[PDB]
Structure formats: C-alpha cells, structure tokens
Amino acid sequence: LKSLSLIAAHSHITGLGLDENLQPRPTSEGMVGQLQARRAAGVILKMVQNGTIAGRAVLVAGPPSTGKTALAMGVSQSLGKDVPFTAIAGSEIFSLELSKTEALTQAFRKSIGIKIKEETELIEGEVVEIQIDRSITGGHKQGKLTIKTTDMETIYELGNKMIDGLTKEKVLAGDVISIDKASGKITKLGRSFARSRDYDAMGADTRFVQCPEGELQKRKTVVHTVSLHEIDVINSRTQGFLALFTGDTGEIRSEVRDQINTKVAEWKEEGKAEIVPGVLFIDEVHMLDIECFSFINRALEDEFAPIVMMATNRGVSKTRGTNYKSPHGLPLDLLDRSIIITTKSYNEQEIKTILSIRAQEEEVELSSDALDLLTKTGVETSLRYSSNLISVAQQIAMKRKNNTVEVEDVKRAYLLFLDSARSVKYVQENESQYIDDQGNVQISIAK
Amino acid sequence: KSLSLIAAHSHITGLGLDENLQPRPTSEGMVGQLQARRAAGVILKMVQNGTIAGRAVLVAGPPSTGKTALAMGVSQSLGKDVPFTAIAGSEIFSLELSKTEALTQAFRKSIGIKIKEETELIEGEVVEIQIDRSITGGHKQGKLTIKTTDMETIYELGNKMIDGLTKEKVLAGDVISIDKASGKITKLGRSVQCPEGELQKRKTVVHTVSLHEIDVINSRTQGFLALFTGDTGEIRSEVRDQINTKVAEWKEEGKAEIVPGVLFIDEVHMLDIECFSFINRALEDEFAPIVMMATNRGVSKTRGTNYKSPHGLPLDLLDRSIIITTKSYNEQEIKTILSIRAQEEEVELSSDALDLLTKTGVETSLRYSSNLISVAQQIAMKRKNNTVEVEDVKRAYLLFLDSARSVKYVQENESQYIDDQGNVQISIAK
Amino acid sequence: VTRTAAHTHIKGLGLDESGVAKRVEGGFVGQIEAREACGVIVDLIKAKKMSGRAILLAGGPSTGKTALALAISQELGPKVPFCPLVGSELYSVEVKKTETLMENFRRAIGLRIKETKEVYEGEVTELTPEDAENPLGGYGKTISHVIVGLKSAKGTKTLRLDPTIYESIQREKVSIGDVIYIEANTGAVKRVGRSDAYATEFDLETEEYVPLPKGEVHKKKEIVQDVTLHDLDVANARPQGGQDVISMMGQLLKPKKTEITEKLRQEVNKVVAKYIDQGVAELIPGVLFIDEVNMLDIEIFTYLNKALESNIAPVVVLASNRGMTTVRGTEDVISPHGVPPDLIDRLLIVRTLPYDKDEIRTIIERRATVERLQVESSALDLLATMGTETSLRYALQLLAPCGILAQTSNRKEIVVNDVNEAKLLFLDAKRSTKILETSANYL
Amino acid sequence: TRTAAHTHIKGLGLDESGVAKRVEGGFVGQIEAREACGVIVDLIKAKKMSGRAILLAGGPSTGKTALALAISQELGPKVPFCPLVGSELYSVEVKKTETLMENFRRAIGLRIKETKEVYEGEVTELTPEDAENPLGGYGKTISHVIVGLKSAKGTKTLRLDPTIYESIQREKVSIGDVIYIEANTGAVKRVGRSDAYATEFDLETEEYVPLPKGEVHKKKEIVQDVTLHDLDVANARPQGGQDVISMMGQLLKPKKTEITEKLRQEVNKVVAKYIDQGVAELIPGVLFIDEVNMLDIEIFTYLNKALESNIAPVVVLASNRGMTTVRGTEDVISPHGVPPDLIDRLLIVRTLPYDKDEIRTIIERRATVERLQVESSALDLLATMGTETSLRYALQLLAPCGILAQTSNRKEIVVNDVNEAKLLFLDAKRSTKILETSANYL
Amino acid sequence: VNKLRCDRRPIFGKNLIDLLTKDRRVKYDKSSIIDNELIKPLQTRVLDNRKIIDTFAVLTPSAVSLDMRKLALGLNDDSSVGENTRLKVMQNCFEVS
Amino acid sequence: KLFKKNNQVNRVDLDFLNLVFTLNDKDLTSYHAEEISKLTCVKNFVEEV
Ligand SMILES: Nc1ncnc2c1ncn2[C@@H]1O[C@H](COP(=O)(O)OP(=O)(O)O)[C@@H](O)[C@H]1O
Ligand SMILES: Nc1ncnc2c1ncn2[C@@H]1O[C@H](COP(=O)(O)OP(=O)(O)O)[C@@H](O)[C@H]1O
Ligand SMILES: Nc1ncnc2c1ncn2[C@@H]1O[C@H](COP(=O)(O)OP(=O)(O)O)[C@@H](O)[C@H]1O
Ligand SMILES: Nc1ncnc2c1ncn2[C@@H]1O[C@H](COP(=O)(O)OP(=O)(O)O)[C@@H](O)[C@H]1O
Ligand SMILES: [Mg+2]
Ligand SMILES: [Mg+2]
Ligand SMILES: [Mg+2]
Ligand SMILES: [Mg+2]
Incomplete structure (x- = not known):
C-alpha cells in the first residue's frame, strides 16, 4: 500500500503458503502449486529467521516461466519488513565506474543489516523571560532564564560559558528551545502561536509548535537500522552520505572494511548494536564473468556472508569468459558449494x-x-x-x-x-522480405 | 583576409551553374562532370528553398574523380550566412563522447537560427566630461558633452552611468558608443573616425546562433565556454526537447527564423554500424540538415559486421539516401x-x-x-x-x-624490405 | 515556411468509435489490422491499470512500423509523456548501459504537481524600519518590524514585514520607486526593475524600466505543472542551493551522469506515494519507444526481463525488421528478430504487411498533396511503376527534385519528361550495385 | 554465534617439536600437509627470509583453504594476514600491477612502543615564586611556578620552570580543573573540569570528569602497530580542513593513484631510521591469493621480479586446477595454471583426498560446531552420501535436516529426515542428469 | 499560514546528523605518538622542498590570455551569477591561503 | 534572457514540497525532526477561525 499501486508481473504473490508444519496448501497466499519447491524455500525461510548460520548458497533451477522468479519474490514478502533484502541481476554488476569484484562486494554488503540504539538526555521547554546583566556590574553577572512547560515550570541559573552560548542563536524568549544536557548544545524549535499575528509576510525559518508536555528533562532511547554498506560508505568519505544518493562510491579500499568489522565487533561486545542476517538474491546468473564466480566462491566463507539464492534457466551451455561448456552455465566449483532446487512445469x-x-x-x-x-x-x-x-x-x-x-x-x-x-x-515464408544475417534483403515486390 | 597559402580546392569557387542549371564546360574553376554538377545544383537550390529537410544524398565515384570538389563547390556556392558542416568519419569516434551523441552534435551544429534585437545607442566624440564627488544635495552630479557633426548636446549622467565612466578610464577626445539598454560603453577609436550624424539611433542587431550553441548554454552554468573547450560531455536529451519547443514558439511569434544548413560527411565507409543505425532515425525527425555522403570504396565489409554489404553501407541507410555517380575524367x-x-x-x-x-x-x-x-x-x-x-x-x-x-x-627488392612474417635480410652476401 | 521530412502527414491512427479502421484516414493507407491492434494499445495506455506491459510490432523494411509508432504518440496527446529512444543511444561512455536503460524507463512516466502561492507585488512607495527601544538582552541592535508600502495600478497597500525579509530587500539594493516581487511561501524578494514613469528623470540610465504591475496588490494563483519522476531524481541528485564557494565550483563543473542508487529512487517513490494519497499530485503512466532493438546487447536484453517486472515499469513498444539472426553479444545463439526467446515470451507480437502497388500509387498522391506540388496523372502512373520496381521510399524521394526541374522549365505541373530527366541524375541502390560490380576501382 | 563453512579449525594442531597429531584443531588426516605447513610457520616466525612463496595444490574439497586459515591462526592476531583473490587484481581505477604491488606492501606490519611519564590530577592552587633576576631590574622576577596536584589516594606538589606559564596560559587552566602534564615534553592538556563542581550550576555546557584514579604521577606504555601501506597512504594523501588543495579535495572525488617508487623508498628511509634506534619493530606478514589460476600472465610476470624484492613478504598460493592454458596465452600449457618460470621460484605442497572414515569424522566434528547432534544410524547414511555425491553436500544437508527435525519437533536427526532433506535439495550430479532428459531448455 | 506551517514543518532527515557522527567518531583515545613524524603530510612537503622548487622551476607558459581566469570561474563584471555571491567568493579567495 | 522569459507562472518551486530532502541531513537531526513534526500547532488556527 505504501509502494506504488501500479500492477507488476506478479502482484498476487504475498508470502509463502506454508503452515507451521511447512506443508504447502494447493492454492494459498497468492501462489499455486510448486509444493516441493515452496517447502524447500520455506526451509530457507526459517533458516534466515533463525540467524544462527551464515555463509551458504542455494540455487533455484527450472525452465522459463516455471515460477522461479515468483518464488524468491515470495520469500522476500514472507520475510517481512526490517529484514534487509537485496535483489539484483547478474548483468548489472558490470560497470565502468566500479570493478566487478568491488561491485559484487557491495552486493554482499547491502544484504546484512545492523540495528543501533542510542539514548539521549535533553531539556526541552518554552521560554518565558531571559535576563542577562551587562553594565550593572560586569563579567557574566549570572543571568537567569525561566523555562515553561505545560505541567511544569522552573528557573535555571546560567553559567558564563552558557551566557556566551546563548548569544549565538539569539533568543528573544517567547520561544520554544531545547538544550542538550551533555554538550550544552542550544537548538531552536520555533516560535509560539502568540507570535503568528505580528507579520503578514514572514520568513521561511519561522514556524509554530505546541508547548512540550510533561517533565522538563527526559531520558529517551532512539533506534536506527543501518546496513554495513552504509557504514562503510560513510566512513570512506569526509561526506559519504551524499555519495550514497549520488551513487558514486569510489571503490572503497578493502583496508577500511576490516576497521569497520572491528568496530561492529566492539559494538556487539558492548551489546549496543545487534545484527540482523539478510538475504541476497541474484536473478539470471547464467550470464556472469568467471572472476565473479571465483570471487563468489571465496567471499561466501567469511564471517558475515548473507544467504544467497539464485535462479538460472540455462541448461548445459558455455560459460561467459571461457570456451568450454560447464553444466548449468556455472563452474563446478560454485555448484560444489550450493544447494539446487528444481521447479517443474505446471499442468x-x-x-x-x-x-x-x-x-x-x-x-x-x-x-x-x-x-x-x-x-x-x-x-x-x-x-x-x-x-x-x-x-x-x-x-x-x-x-x-x-x-x-x-x-x-x-x-x-x-x-x-x-x-x-x-x-x-x-x-520463414516471407524471408525474402525481412533482412537477413548476410544483410541481403529484397525491397521491391515487382519481379 | 583569412591567411591561407594553397589548398587542393583553393581554385574551384562556387561550383558553376547557369539560370537553366545546365553546367558550362568551364565555369568558376569547375571543369568536367556535367551530370554531377547538375544534380549537385538541384540539391543546392533544394537547400536554398528550405521547404524539405532531413534528406540524405550519396556521392559515389572512383578515387580522385569529381567527388570532394563537388561538395566543396556546393559549400562555396551556398555562400556565407548559411551553415555548412564537414566532418570525417573517423572524427566522430571519441573517447570522451559517445558515438551517438557526437553524431547528434553535428546535426545540431548544421542548423542555425537568426535572432534580432533592437537597441538605442548614443555615440559621438566626448569633448568635456565632468564628474563630481558625492554631496548632501545629490548622490552624484556629472555632465558629459557628446559632440557629433550634425548635432551636439549635453547629457546629465544617471549615477551608475557615472560608475561606468569612472569604472573604465575615459580620456576626453575619443569616439565612444554608449549603450543605454545594455549599460556598457564601446570605444570605436580616437578623434581615426569621424562623427557620422545624430547621436541616438534605433538599430536592429541580428544574431545567427546554431541549435547546438543554444543547447550548450542551457545545460551548463556557462555553456559558451563548453562550446570552445569541447568538454560539453553528453547534454541531456530533455534539454534539447525543451529547446525544440521554445524554438517553435519563437518561430510562431516571429522573433526568430531557422536556416536549413547542410551536413557533409567525408569517409562515410569507415563509420560504425551503430552510427548508420542512428542516422536512419535522425533523418526522419523534424529538425535535421540535408545530408550528403561520399564513399570511394564499394562492395566491401561494413565495420562492426562480418558480412559484406554493397558499397560498404547498409541497405537500410541506402534506402534513405539518393545516389549520385561520378565518372572518370577523359x-x-x-x-x-x-x-x-x-x-x-x-x-x-x-x-x-x-x-x-x-x-x-x-x-x-x-x-x-x-x-x-x-x-x-x-x-x-x-x-x-x-x-x-x-x-x-x-x-x-x-x-x-x-x-x-x-x-x-x-616486388624485385622484396628480399630487402620487411615482410608480413617479419623476415628481412640486412646482410649483403651469403 | 513549413518543413516536411518523411513525416507530418500522419495525424493519428484514425480509428472509429467501434474500433474499425477506415480504408484511408489521417495520412494512413491500408493496414487495418495493425491499426486496430495499436488502438487497443492506446486504450490500455489510457486505462492506467497496467504497468510494464510490452507489445512488439515487427515487419519488413518500409512497412510503416515507425510511422505507426509516431501515430500512437499523436493519438495519446501532448499530456501523455512519450520518449523516443534508439538501441544505439543506450551505449554511453560516462555510465554503464544498464543505468541508461533504467534511466529512460523512469523518464517515460510522469507526475503532475499543484501548489498555491500568494504574492505581493508593486512599486515601493515608502519603506521604513522600526527599531525597538527595549534591549531585550538578546541583541545589541535590531528592528521589531519593517513596513514597506506597495503601489499598483488597481490599488495601493502597506505591508508589515519581519527584519529577515527586509534584509533580503537590502541585499537586492531596492530603493524607493522600484518594482519588487515578494512571495509569501518561500519569502524570497526579487527586484524586477525601476518604474516606467521615473525613466524621464535622467538623460542616460543603466537600469531597465518596466511598467507598474496590474492587480490590486495581493494575488492568489496555483501552478499545475507536471514533472517526470526522473527529473525529480536528477534535481534530487544535484542541489541548486547554498552560497558556499564549493557549491559555486560544483555548478561550474560539467554535469556528469552517475548511477543512481535504488534507495533514493525508493524515497522518491515514498514521497510521491504520499502526495498521491493526499490528492495534491496525480501520477500518470507513459510510453517508452525503442527503435532497432536488434542492436541491443544480450546484457540489456537480460536486464529488460527484470526491468519489466517492476511496478513502476512503463509500457514499452519494440520494433524490429530483420528475421532470425545471431543476437549481438552471443556467439552461436540464433533467434528471430534479434531478440532472445525469453524476452519474446514476455512481449506481444504484431506483424506488418507490405503495400500493394495500387496503394503505393495513392501514397505518392498524398505525399504530393502534403508536398503541395502538382503532379500529372500520366506521370503519376509512371512514378507508381517506378516506385514498385525499386522501392516505395525511392518515389517519395523522387517527388522532391522534380519540383526544381519544373521551376527551371517554368511548368507548374510535373511532366513525364521531368521525372524521366530526374531518373538519370539520381540512381537507386539496385543500379548502383550493378555499376559497382564492373569498374576499375570500386566504381 | 555465527558459523560459515569454518570455525572448527583452531590453529594447525601441531605438538612440540614433533609430528602432527592425528586429530587436533578440527583437522583429520593430511598429517604431512599440515606438518609441512607447520615448518612454514617456523620460517615465518624467523622473520629473516623475504619473497619466498609456496603453493599448495590439490583437487577440490581437499582442504586447501583451511590450511591457509590454519597457518593464519598459528601466526597470531598480531601478525598481519591479508586474504586476497586473484580476481581482485583487476581494477578500473589503477593498473593491475599497482594493485599487486600495494597488496604486497599491505602484508608487512610495523609496531611502535612508547613510554611516557604523566602528571594528572586536580589543581589545589597555583602560586609564583619570586627571586632576584641575574641582571638587576625594578620589575618582578619569578624563579619557579608551584603547581599542586590532587588525585584519589594521594596528593603532590610540583615545581616547574617559569616557561610553563605560556603553556598554562594557552590551556587556560586556573583552579579546581583536572589537567594533563607530560614529564619531559612538558606543556599541559586540559581534559575537563572536576566532577565535584557540577552542582554549583544548575545548567552548564561543560562536562565534569572525575579525579584521576591512583597516584598523581604515572608511567605507562602504549604499543601501536601500523602497516607500511597504511603509512604510505597518509604520506601521499593531503590532509587539511580549509587548505586550497584540500578545498579541491572536496567537490572532486578521490581515486587510487599509482604511488611512485621514490616515495616508497623515502618511507623506507625513515622506517629504517626508527628501527635502528630501537623504537620501531618490523614484523613481516603473509599474503594469500586464492584461485591463482585466475591471474593473467602479465601479473605472473610481475611476480617474478616482485618476489626478488628485499622487503617482499611470504606469499602462499592455492591452485586447484591441473594442466591448463595460462590466461593470456592460448598455446602455452603449464600445470596448475602457473607458468613454469614462476613454478621454478616456489615449493609445491601436495594435498590428498579424504578417506571414508575421515569423512564420517569430518561430519561428526562439524555436528558439534553446528550444535546439532545426530544418531549413529543416520550418520552412516551421511557418510555414504558424502562419498558418493560429494563432501560439501553432506555438510550442506546438516542445517535442513535440523530445521525439518524442528518441524517434526524431534531434537535429533533421523533417517527419514535425511531422506526428506535428500529429496528437497539436489546435488550437482542429479541436476546435470535431469538437464539431459528435458527438452524444455532446463 | 496554516497550510504553510503544515507543509514546512514535516522535514525528515532520511538518516540523521547523529547517525553521521555516531558511525564516525572513534572510541580509541588520541594516543600522542611519534607517528606524527612518520606522516609528514603532502602540504608540509611543499614547504620543506622550497629550495628544490626555487632552483629547478624555470619554464613559463609563453602564451597566455589575460582575463581568462575571471571568466573561467564565472565571476566577472557581467555574468549569470549573483551580484553579492561573486563578491563573497572574491573575499573568500582573498582570505584562504 | 530569452530563456529567462516568464517561468514561475508555470514553474513549481519544488523545494517547498520537500522533494529535495537529501539536503536535510546536514543541519537537521532525527529526534528534532520527530518532535518538531509531533508538536505542530495545527488545530489552533481552526479554533481562531
Ligand atoms: N506459484 C505461482 N502461482 C501462480 N502463478 C505463478 C506462480 N509462479 C509463477 N507464476 C507465473 O509465472 C510468471 C513469471 O514466471 P518467472 O518466474 O518469471 O519465470 P522465469 O523466472 O523462468 O522467467 C508470472 O506471470 C506468474 O503469473
Ligand atoms: N571537376 C573538377 N575540376 C577541377 N579539379 C578537379 C575536379 N575533380 C577533381 N579535381 C581535382 O581533384 C583533386 C581532389 O580530388 P577529390 O575530388 O578529392 O577526389 P576524391 O573526392 O574521390 O578523393 C583536387 O585537387 C582537384 O583539383
Ligand atoms: N500506411 C502508410 N500510409 C502512408 N504512408 C506510409 C504508410 N506506411 C509507410 N509510410 C511511409 O513510409 C515512410 C517510411 O516508412 P517507415 O515507417 O520509416 O518504415 P520502417 O518502419 O521500416 O522504418 C514514412 O515516411 C511513411 O510516411
Ligand atoms: N582436516 C579437516 N577436517 C575437517 N574438515 C575439513 C578438513 N579439511 C577440509 N575440511 C572441510 O573442507 C572445507 C574447505 O574446503 P576447501 O579447501 O575450500 O576446498 P578447495 O580445496 O576446493 O578450496 C571446509 O568447509 C572444511 O569443513
Ligand atoms: Mg526471473
Ligand atoms: Mg574524398
Ligand atoms: Mg526507420
Ligand atoms: Mg578455496
């Protein structure tokens, strides 16, 4: 419903039709048939939801239009939100900007996620009056400001460094601001409603918000979900967040990735951040370079390897980049470490x-x-x-x-x-009319 | 002007023709080639008419016979104020630009546009110019005397006008032309020239600008530098789609006109098959130049494919083009x-x-x-x-x-020369 | 006056309300089947329910494929986005072909945006600052409000402004008697120019002069402008904001295409998905058109399989000529039309028939009427036989030069002698090959 | 607790100055292989030889990589070990040669240890000491500055030269604030205010750190290790916030640039200068290239001249393939994919396939790390299946059998569960046999 | 004004500014080391090499075009850039060294 | 100037509707955005109306 409502190839498939006993229903959850393949997919589903295993590959095989694409797509829907999923194509990892090896490394990085939690102590309230003495005596005369909330009102003494800090982001009071407790950072939320009628045309900075309710200072924790890839791109650049949206990564050096791995290890040791195992799905892998195959063979054995599933409809055929014909279109090394799931044509x-x-x-x-x-x-x-x-x-x-x-x-x-x-x-009957591989074509009908 | 020493085509100027389009035996540096000159003349009058656009024509013939000189005489007979583009087939291949965009860039270069603007300019000798510092009475007070032969009057400056006269040092006694609407001063010489007449005159300024030149300026902050520097780098097609509509509205309003220039391509046989496939679509559009292509070779292999097409061009392109043949000289x-x-x-x-x-x-x-x-x-x-x-x-x-x-x-000395296999004998004896 | 390149005589498909195609309508002759076939396509494009659906129309050369592909675009109208594309254009040096294909895919669809803005405009009569005597402790010196009067032809009004929007006016260097433009939403102030009546004050002036704006003072207007999603993506990638010296050099650098991440596209789909829920925006699908699809690599053909399964995938139409040939990028693979069979399975096939001689004779007639020239019937028959003996597109090319020979002969109508003379100066491909075979050097 | 195809390997599993044990560190069989590698561990710990490469060859699933992970464990976490694949040498940013030379210098690390005496604590008071100047003058003359320091469990008073007043003025410390003072280097550092002063103000923007624990005077040592490549990157890369060159760092993009030999030699000069004084310690590492068969002959050529370098580390190679045509040359045929000239510079370590009895022990040892326990009857099937289908197939079927066991609620795998897992997941041979019987293009 | 405030306020950071400084700042301390003498950044090498640059820099760009520097950056008396923006940029370039 | 002919007639600012949002992470935080969006003054204008 949040996604755009335009209908796709398969919009009917939602989740998988397996019960708690994993026995598939003949028609359920948008799909039809494919009982054994759906059960073999559900074993992978609980395999991901368990999260205790890593670094494994699985293959989905079948002829064209057998339901292989509507299968992995059904796995991503039953997997649900907050579990990171990456669906790409084998032809997409060929890029002029990035090398295929690093472009595949990013494909393995985006799938595994990280949840980080952080707590904050802030003082937020509407301001009544602010007094600062200057020429009466001098030298930070200890002015006092009164902060108002709906259910509470108190008076706070202001220190010398806070006197210097309040001058920046000047406050006339009549205003709602929030001050950080740890760093003493001053933040201005916006003016109250009584200030709305002063001007007919006002600037773009102005705004009106209700007075904060409850206690003056509060203790609140915030949760964030950030993938390892985003962390690496952020750490790779001075400003990496813009590099995320612009799409130019720059082929991050593999040196920083180890440092990020140690950082995630320390965060897991402290218990502040937990990791969610993700899923990686590559569609149409029958066309891939051999360097990518070998790099998949090696990169699957690391500590964080997202579960990989793939679908290829080619039979025994020549692999791209080599003259010889390997079965299934993949080298026997990639087929050695894998599990093959076959789909059968519908009746x-x-x-x-x-x-x-x-x-x-x-x-x-x-x-x-x-x-x-x-x-x-x-x-x-x-x-x-x-x-x-x-x-x-x-x-x-x-x-x-x-x-x-x-x-x-x-x-x-x-x-x-x-x-x-x-x-x-x-x-075949009109061949003389259509263009030919040799380039010969007969335009004129008259003979 | 335009220093040039000697060119191969330096002699032939403007082909040659008569009001009956029948070529003379020797007319304006063009001998021989009777039929070819008549067909090329028909194409020339077709360009001068401008009713039809986006048509391709082919000039075929043996090497060194009546081929490039044709297009040269058509370009020279077409004269100045009309665009003519001549590019080699190997020139469109570029490492920084794609072949398709570099091929469209010529189609955009070959069509020009004339834009007219009216301005009121005051020019004349300055005998006396007085400028005063800021006072309480007024911001600045100054009076400049512009003397011309027919009329001599004095103007009181407009503030920022005084900033333009003090901005660039001006000495009394030189002939300048001040632009009221533009707000800048143009010095035409010293009093080198003589005052012609009345100070203020209304003139119109016609500017001939190609579609490419309009296209580059909008895609960049400063696009006129991207014109000269060749760093243009694949302008978006959306910008061009806006340029076409804006030009259409300019034509309906009558503020601009388009000139159907000519695009000549030397060495078309060496063009890649992708470019041949793009030309077919590029010809059928609304704004396209009249295209003339010349290939010396025939019955050869098209670059990018294994098979050999006749004349070295794909038949799909040959359908869109009209073929003109040249004959060996007697x-x-x-x-x-x-x-x-x-x-x-x-x-x-x-x-x-x-x-x-x-x-x-x-x-x-x-x-x-x-x-x-x-x-x-x-x-x-x-x-x-x-x-x-x-x-x-x-x-x-x-x-x-x-x-x-x-x-x-x-063939007799082959033993001395290097061979495809790399064998050579540099020793005289044995 | 008017320019005609192998086109502009087709005003649409020309279908009745029942879907039956007339014998001849809208510059189109014959091909009732292919016309009825594309009309249902137009109806599906208007239905807006289907996305990613694709239909391929394949036929011989000069069978009217492309001419029909322009006719469907004429049938959709200016409001429906139509993006022409050729397979050879997808290859780019800056970015991989895949990002260009997905890029055009998003360039096809489009979205309309409506928002209301209220603007005060007019000549400044008297502007005065108002300073507060109260120090307040927050600032050493400031202003409480700034009152600026505005004059217009219909009426005059005084406004009360905040010190910031007055600081913008001080940046614009506005003086009494100059027309200004003040918008309430963004709070931006723009100076149009000095008023026209004040022009006579000075003999020489640098500043331009404009008349006083019509309207009382305040104006309420909405902007219905429609913008494609891809334009939102490009505007999202390159910010126009900020005064930083870095941003200036960022504007100076040439725009360089880059591969856009899926996350940003997803966020744009989220905010648009919200605006379509509020009713402030309305999304409309659009049509993608690719010519000479056979020139595509098997990589782009494979990516088209995953691209068509997306929900935002617009309707795309493909047209190809050649029969069964080796697909580019493949060694031993042979597939019809130069498209892999897995993609052919997704599309719908429409076939285009050739044209009878009697139809060609009418094609030359209509091309002559749009060409505005004058053709005799006796020469029209010979031009028809000529077009049938060589090619259909060769006679339409023969109509152009004869008009020039007729002017040199001063005859208003084309005569058989004129075209017979035009045949000797201009040869088609068949004669060129024949003369090409026998000669000294490559003819 | 995540386990991917590994983590049951702990070290090589050798003993003291003797033949390797039968089963240690999750290793079964192949005593000669991990023994020969055991000698290589000693060669690397010697820290003498340079540019000495070795290559372990053998069939697939013979335990080639687990030996490299094992020696990587045996060297220790402090010894740098760089996992690398032959496919990673190709990069669009720079040539393959520069990437190979960079990875060659990523292997060797450098350790730095520093001992510095510190004075930390609160400030009890600050008073000058006035004394007569050497040349007579009316104004004041201070001989020394007295600084008190308070910490938990102790207190101390110090006397400093009068030049300390400039550093104290720079750090702006007065009274009641914890400071940082280094003995010989001097000056000051202000960490933050003392903790007891947080109460005097209800709102303040300065944090209050507690007093330092232990004595006010401390002596501690810190060891920092950095690789030579990470050192070179810092030398080649400009560093500044506002600098004009750094200003061009922003709005542009950084890209890997080929590093000149002059810069590398210049870094070697200062590294040698610090290693002569005893402050620096150079520990050579190990480079590991998986699937060397994927390397072009241009890289194989650069390895010949590169391995003869003086600072070149020990690099271990793995090639599973047999006689093949080297990439880049169609006519040339050499074993394992490595050219004979490069084979001449290394030592080959053979690997043998595992016996049936060794396979069953492989699965039973994998069960412990998998935390899943299996019966004796269902294990005998996993042995035969492992020998017929493939070794990695029986290891791959472990988790699906456990998930199916959870669907059946049983805590241990059964023969019915391994058969049901057999029917759901097919190995390579069955699939390749199915492709032949189908005309569907499957 | 009600719709104005209803529009302006819901501006959501797609990630955060606190996520940028959270994943950046290092837990490890400063650890003042002699490594400062093992870095010698590129900017300092320009200062330490002054003699070699002074002696070995000879050639000059014989052909130049004046007022091509102002026109390249787009800052000049007449352009599409703002009036005050070119002045602020001119002062920023006049300051930074 | 010929392409500077009237635009804002049919032009949308496009920066007022927060479709440029990728610039919001520089000066703006998360919790301030959530609380700022929760504290909105709407329903007071309805009362004053
Ligand atoms: N379980 C299913 N139930 C209903 N329809 C299905 C199912 N699986 C696949 N399909 C149909 O198959 C089509 C997609 O096939 P796809 O998986 O793309 O084949 P391939 O991946 O071999 O190209 C969809 O149109 C969908 O209707
Ligand atoms: N009709 C002609 N009149 C005069 N000179 C000619 C003519 N045709 C060819 N030439 C001469 O031929 C030379 C170039 O031949 P060109 O036409 O370029 O052959 P091609 O175009 O086949 O390479 C020119 O120096 C020109 O003097
Ligand atoms: N049914 C038709 N009625 C009128 N003109 C046609 C018809 N079919 C083709 N044409 C004309 O033929 C010319 C070229 O045909 P085109 O559609 O470009 O062939 P192709 O589809 O092979 O590219 C067009 O300019 C068009 O005007
Ligand atoms: N001594 C051993 N004991 C138990 N398992 C082993 C042993 N040696 C190898 N293995 C198994 O072999 C797998 C690694 O094989 P690998 O060396 O990558 O094959 P290849 O030789 O094709 O690279 C590991 O998952 C591990 O379980
Ligand atoms: Mg699929
Ligand atoms: Mg020539
Ligand atoms: Mg066509
Ligand atoms: Mg291995």
Missing part, C-alpha cells in the same frame, strides 16, 4: 487457477467459457503469454461496453496479436 | 584541370610540357601530375628560367617515383 489444472487468480488481480470478470479457450491456448503457448491476452481482451470487451469478456472478443484478441510460434512461420 | 579534361592548377599556383607550363604532363596524368593519375606541377617549378628556379621545361618535368619524373613503379620495384 493444465493449475494453469486455469493461475489465470483466474490473475483476473482477480486485474479485476476482470471472465465468462466460464473464456478460461477454456484461454487455457487451451495457454497449454500450447507459455503461461506468461495468455496473461497478456487476459489484459487485452478486457479492453476489446470494453469497446463492446458489456460487462465480462466474451469468447468472441478473446478470439479477436488472439487474432490481432500473433503467438511466438506463428511469427517464426510468417518470417 | 584525356581532354585532365589538361584543362592541370592548366587551372597552373594558373592557381603561378606556374608557367609550355605546351610541350603540358603534353607530357597530360600523358603521365592519363597513364598514372591526376593527383600525381598535379603534385609534380608544383615540384618542377623549383627545378626550373635553379635554372633561373621563368618557364618550366620538358627536361625539368623528366627530372622531376625520375627523382620522385610513382606508386605503380614503386610497387614493381618492391
């Missing part, structure tokens, strides 16, 4: 539920005979195809203005938009 | 061309030497003999005679070898 019965459950998402009413033709065309074609026809047939039926999508509108929608298998035939 | 034209170069280089050639130079021009090449005509003048200069002689042409023929002769010499 006819499941496809119609995947369709109707999609029409519920698009809010498109369908006739009982529309799912028959859309399912029949869905079997010969791919499940990912007819899902677009369910969208177009809604507009074609909208032109006819009547309610649910009729079968004839589905036939017209299938007639206007060609299947991937038909375009191959139309190209 | 024997009677070569002597007239070499005579034109003789008149251009201040070289006196006898008819007997012109016959041998023509025969060598037909047997080998025109570019060669036209190089020799320059070298023989010094050999004739050592003999102190003003006119070149046959013996000097023969001496210049034996001293400097031709290409065909040098190849036949290399």
